[PDB]
Ligand binder design. Structure first.
Ligand SMILES: Nc1nc2c(ncn2[C@@H]2O[C@H](COP(=O)(O)OP(=O)(O)O)[C@@H](O)[C@H]2O)c(=O)[nH]1
Ligand SMILES: [Mg+2]
Lengths: 37, 405, 117, 292, 205, 105
């Protein structure tokens, strides 16, 4: 398929401090139903 | 092709000594190859949110595919019993065909474990159970060897259960831009492929496929709705058997493509071109005047390159008619061989805007086709009228021009 | 703005029917699975990224006071891209994304973290 | 104010049972359905209104325990304030438990040697009543000899179980070693005790119902704090049935239980039975903003 | 008719006639406007009985094309009224015995249209207020109507559907091989599955 | 767990006239038969409670019934579907265990 399609859904900024891993920032807050369809 | 399996092993969650490799074939393959079951042990036996899913990750140069399964019942110790049939592949491959097989194997063994505890009692250890209320290694050997050699297995594990795995290739879905003006070819003989299990529509489409019937013509001939013909043609494209083409006229703008050098660089193209384009006998069509023994390969190559972007087929045929008469060449077969080998293409005609009284539906679909900038072919198919009548109707409707793209 | 409509919004703590803590857990690998590709697939969801982990020393790469505390306490940061390619183009989409975006972005992030946090 | 707590032990030691009953509000009968903790289960818990507790519920199984001291040694045991090692008296591999504890102490001494080690001899209800104290002392002597070898001169131990109230006392004394401004709380509680002329005033937390401080630090029961904590937990779980939350409780106009703030619950026992309720309630409301 | 004649499988569905492709006897189990996407697992897990009511009835031309006519006249003797059994109890027992075979009580618009082209049709049966009941029952074999009055003379008219050229004689004999659980060899079945049928009961006796 | 005749269903429906019911109401017939009103419909809405009249199409679904299965063993049972599964493998791995789990639930 020569049609360009970058199948992206979101990004995460996961850091690992000494108190455990945590999520700092993910940009798209939409659910699975809107993102996949 | 199918990637061979590198190492199969069977993990299990011991309630005392944790997750470990219970069995592995080939033996000591992971330690010899560098794979360590202390880095990705949290994905093989995960917390019960990742369970019953097709976990697939990358470890170094090896891609690891697994389907972890966790059963929840008070019979087992710690109210859980987790295992995983893990498949390991090299990274530089395609693990797509093995994924449904691994998922179904995990699902089947989950069903058997929920039914009669086939995998938990095989450990012969009462520490897996509450205690208050078949060989896995041979199975792994047979799975690994049969999937490496035959890509199939009928491995028996009990009196009524068998591991039945077949690996199929993955095929691309067909196009959606198939319309009523495209003629379907058939690179395979569709007469001998028909068996009792075919769709009733696809049975009817097969006789009316000869490289010159449009999809609407096939639908009208076989008394079929065009939508189901579209779906059946898509199914035939899906198996790489039917390729679309263009309606052959004598008003077409056929032109050489960038693959016209294939008529010289292919040793088996011109030799079939001599026999293909010739009439079986001395046909009378090669004896009509312009107005009132097999062909040379150089003649065919000169006739292929004689087409141009703007010279219609009528003008080219009436400008070169002695050559196509002495050599006894069928012009439709001559064009069709070039189109099938993708050495010449067609410049489509576009009526962009700037007689008998037709019906309201005809003028409505005419306006809808004009607004969408559809070709002359689609308008001719939808109106069931030739090019001249369509041009006259459009000229009566408004001024317009033809683009030969 | 379509990501924040009422019909297309989810809580911040939930990412695709998974909690934030669990996603932060399984997207934070060990040392042996860091400083390389992290092509993780659950079910039609390729969690892809290039984790950058500190070495044996405090070096990120080799040649308010909560900010300095977090700079001296952080040992790994990960930029995880969620992708859902088709099964026939997985090895194309994931490879081109990692080749053209993720690698360069994570290398620049590691460099700028190494010089000035 | 982030405090990193480590909860280690062997398989089936009941660490997750402690975490569930103390913090996640599960009953003692509801700990049987708990599964096996895989790797480390982090739990960010907010104590009072400023403290947050990063409790690390480690696995405790052989693969996890061997993984902790080899590869994750530079992550688990750094910036650690309190270690809570849980020992099972039903275990038949007590020497392996002591060796695992020695390895944990060695790693903590190597990385963060300013921590506070606490040991809980859990599951001390299957053993008979006559030998509980003797078994606790016998194991505590060995644990103190082992603890003093790898630095750490002090080691406080508690006989704990989920079928009694000793868990509340053990977790209260574990938590209170991290609470800041304890001296100011003690001084203000002593001042309030002198002002109200009370026999003994105890200060709790609203959510976990753990003891924070007491006015004193007729002979009374030395184990009264843990029993009041268990009774208040049972009463809160009973008042959840009435679709509401517990606010106040007055017993014989002598024992006053009231919500001092949004994060603490006061337990006041006065001396005179003739004081009207409104005066005590007004004096409680005056001190509501004082302890904030 | 037990089938609809599709002109060709290659033509598509005309509007939404697929929802009209439902059995007449089981049509009343579905709701009026709830979609059929919900009643998928309910048919598997909790199978539904054949409903008491039927909402279909033959038109005026169907009764004048292929049907016949009979008559009943039943009234309990003086022996049975020694017990507490009146004509209402006999009518209730008769409607009870009309069921358990496949009969369905007719109520709706078509039944009222047939009744007018000859007053109130009933579905249930209350003996306190009403004292004269009229209610129709229909199976593919025969159609019943039961009428009553204060006189106690129960009139029953049955419209038997005539068989079409002996369909049970136009089929060849078919005796398969049946192997049960305790057997070890495929023996021979003792009944023809094709030629066994629910016979028309003698309702007069 | 109780055998009702067709006429018994008719009589029970006749007794359930001019009487309002609601969801999960345990009706009783002859002091032994137990019922459960699992669904009341009106104008396409699943109302919590409704009124049962003379023209109410009341149905009697059975939660304990005799079932007959007729499995076709043909040449297609060992055929393979496009995903890569045999049809009898589907029957013994995804239809029967799911229906037994649903029946137990
Ligand atoms: N009888 C008794 N059982 C206990 C006690 N504490 C824990 N348990 C048992 O421990 C089991 C749960 O263990 P768990 O917390 O998951 O162990 P961990 O994962 O090592 O922390 C439950 O089934 C309880 O029956 C106790 O004090 N007495
Ligand atoms: Mg645990």
């Amino acid at each position: 398929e020569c049609l360009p399609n970058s199948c992206l859904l979101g990004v995460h900024l996961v850091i690992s401090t000494h108190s455990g891993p945590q999520i700092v920032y993910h940009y798209p807050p939409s659910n699975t139903a809107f993102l996949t369809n | 092709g199918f990637v061979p399996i590198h190492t199969i092993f069977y993990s299990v969650f011991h309630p005392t000594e944790g997750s470990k490799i219970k069995y592995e074939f080939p033996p000591n393959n992971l330690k010899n190859h560098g794979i360590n079951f202390n880095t990705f042990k949290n994905y093989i036996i995960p917390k019960p949110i990742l369970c019953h899913k097709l976990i697939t990750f990358k470890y170094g140069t090896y891609r690891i595919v697994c389907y972890p399964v966790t059963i929840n019942s008070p019979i087992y110790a710690r109210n859980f019993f987790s295992f995983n049939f893990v498949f390991v592949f090299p990274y530089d491959c395609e693990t797509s065909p093995y994924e449904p097989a691994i998922t179904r194997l995990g699902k089947m063994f989950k069903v058997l474990e929920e039914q009669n505890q086939l995998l938990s009692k095989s450990e012969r250890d009462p520490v897996f159970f509450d205690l208050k209320v078949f060989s896995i290694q041979d199975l792994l050997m047979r799975i690994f060897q049969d999937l490496n050699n035959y890509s199939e297995c009928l491995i028996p594990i009990d009196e009524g259960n068998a591991v039945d795995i077949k690996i199929f290739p993955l095929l691309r879905p067909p196009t959606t831009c198939v319309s009523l003006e495209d003629v379907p070819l058939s690179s395979v003989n569709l007469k001998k492929i028909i068996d009792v299990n075919w769709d009733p529509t696809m049975m009817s489409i097969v006789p009316y496929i000869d490289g010159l019937n449009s999809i609407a013509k096939i639908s009208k001939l076989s008394n079929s709705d065009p939508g189901l013909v579209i779906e059946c043609i898509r199914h035939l494209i899906y198996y790489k058997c039917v390729t679309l083409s263009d309606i052959f006229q004598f008003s077409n703008i056929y032109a050489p493509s960038s693959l016209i050098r294939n008529f010289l660089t292919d040793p088996l193209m011109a030799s079939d071109c001599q026999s293909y384009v010739t009439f079986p006998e001395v046909s009378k069509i090669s004896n009509l005047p312009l107005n009132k023994f097999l062909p040379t390969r150089s003649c065919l190559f000169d006739l292929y390159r004689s087409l141009s972007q703007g010279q219609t087929l009528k003008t080219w045929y009436e400008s070169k008619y002695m050559i196509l008469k002495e050599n006894n060449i069928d012009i439709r077969r001559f064009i069709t061989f070039g189109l099938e080998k993708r050495i010449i293409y067609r410049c489509y005609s576009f009526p962009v805007m700037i007689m008998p009284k037709l019906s309201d539906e005809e003028e409505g679909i005419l306006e809808e086709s004009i607004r969408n900038a559809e070709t002359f072919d689609k308008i001719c198919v939808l109106l069931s009228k030739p090019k001249l009548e369509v041009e006259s109707y459009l000229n009566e409707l408004g001024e317009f021009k033809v683009i030969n793209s | 703005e379509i990501f924040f409509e009422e019909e297309n919004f989810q809580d911040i703590n939930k990412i695709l029917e998974f909690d934030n803590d669990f996603v932060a857990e399984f997207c934070s690998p060990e040392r042996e699975m860091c400083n390389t590709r992290f092509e993780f697939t659950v079910d039609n969801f390729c969690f892809l990224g290039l984790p950058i982990h500190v070495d044996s020393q405090g070096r990120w790469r080799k040649s308010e006071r909560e900010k300095e505390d977090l700079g001296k306490n952080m040992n790994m940061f990960h930029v995880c891209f969620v992708m859902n390619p088709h099964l026939i183009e997985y090895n194309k989409r994931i490879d081109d994304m990692y080749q053209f975006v993720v690698t360069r972005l994570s290398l620049l992030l590691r460099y700028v973290q190494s010089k000035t946090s | 104010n982030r405090k990193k707590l480590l909860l280690m032990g062997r398989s089936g030691s009941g660490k997750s049972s402690m975490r569930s009953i103390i913090f996640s509000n599960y009953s003692a009968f509801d700990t049987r359905r708990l599964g096996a903790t895989i790797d480390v289960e982090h739990s960010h818990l907010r104590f009072l209104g400023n403290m947050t507790l990063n409790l690390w519920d480690c696995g405790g199984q052989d693969v996890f325990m061997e993984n902790y001291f080899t590869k994750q040694k530079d992550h688990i045991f750094q910036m650690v304030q309190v270690l809570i090692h849980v020992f099972d008296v039903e275990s038949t591999e007590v020497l392996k438990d002591i060796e695992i504890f020695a390895k944990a102490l060695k790693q903590l001494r190597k990385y963060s040697p300013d921590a506070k080690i606490f040991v809980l001899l859990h599951k001390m209800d299957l053993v008979q009543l006559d030998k509980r104290e003797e078994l606790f002392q016998i194991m505590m002597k060995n644990l103190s000899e082992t603890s003093s070898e790898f630095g750490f001169p002090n080691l406080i131990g508690f006989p704990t179980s989920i079928w009694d109230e000793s868990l509340y006392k053990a977790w209260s004394q574990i938590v209170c070693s991290l609470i800041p401004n304890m001296s100011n709380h003690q001084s203000n509680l002593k001042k309030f005790k002198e002002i109200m002329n009370a026999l003994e005033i105890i200060l709790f937390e609203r959510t976990t119902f753990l003891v924070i401080c007491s006015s004193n630090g007729v002979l009374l029961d030395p184990k009264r704090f843990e029993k009041i904590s268990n009774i208040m937990k049972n009463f809160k779980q009973s008042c959840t049935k009435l679709k509401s939350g517990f606010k106040t409780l007055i017993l014989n106009n002598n024992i006053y239980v009231s919500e001092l703030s949004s994060n603490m619950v006061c337990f006041i026992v006065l001396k005179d039975m003739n004081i009207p309720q409104e005066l005590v309630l007004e004096n409680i409301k005056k001190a509501k903003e004082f302890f904030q | 008719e037990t089938w609809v004649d599709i002109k060709s499988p290659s033509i598509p569905v005309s509007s939404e006639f697929a929802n009209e492709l439902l059995p007449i006897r089981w049509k009343d189990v579905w709701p009026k406007y709830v979609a059929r996407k919900y009643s998928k697992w309910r048919s598997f897990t909790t199978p539904a009985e054949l409903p008491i009511t039927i909402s279909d009835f033959p038109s005026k031309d169907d009764f004048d094309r292929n049907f016949i006519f009979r008559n009943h006249s039943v009234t309990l003797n003086t022996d049975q009224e020694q017990y507490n059994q009146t004509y209402k109890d006999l009518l209730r027992d008769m409607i009870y015995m009309r069921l358990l075979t496949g009969f369905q009580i007719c109520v709706g618009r078509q039944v009222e249209k047939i009744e007018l082209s000859r007053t109130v049709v009933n579905k249930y049966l209350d003996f306190n207020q009403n004292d004269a009941f009229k209610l129709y029952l229909m199976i593919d074999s025969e159609i019943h109507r039961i009428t009553c009055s204060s006189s106690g003379i129960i009139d029953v008219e049955r419209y038997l559907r005539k068989d079409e050229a002996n369909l049970f004689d136009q089929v060849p004999s078919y005796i398969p091989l049946v192997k049960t659980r305790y057997e070890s060899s495929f023996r021979d079945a003792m009944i023809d599955p094709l030629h066994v049928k629910r016979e028309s009961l003698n309702w007069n006796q | 767990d109780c055998l009702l005749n067709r006429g018994d269903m008719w009589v029970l429906s006749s007794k359930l006239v001019d009487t309002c019911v609601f969801m999960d109401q345990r009706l009783a017939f002859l002091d032994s038969i137990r019922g459960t009103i699992k669904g009341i419909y009106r104008n396409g809405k699943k109302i919590v409670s409704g009124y049962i009249g003379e023209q109410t199409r009341i149905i009697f679904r059975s939660e304990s019934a005799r079932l007959i299965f007729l499995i076709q063993i043909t040449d297609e049972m060992w055929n393979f579907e496009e995903t890569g599964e045999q049809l009898f493998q589907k029957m013994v791995n995804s239809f029967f265990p799911k229906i037994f789990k649903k029946w137990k639930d």
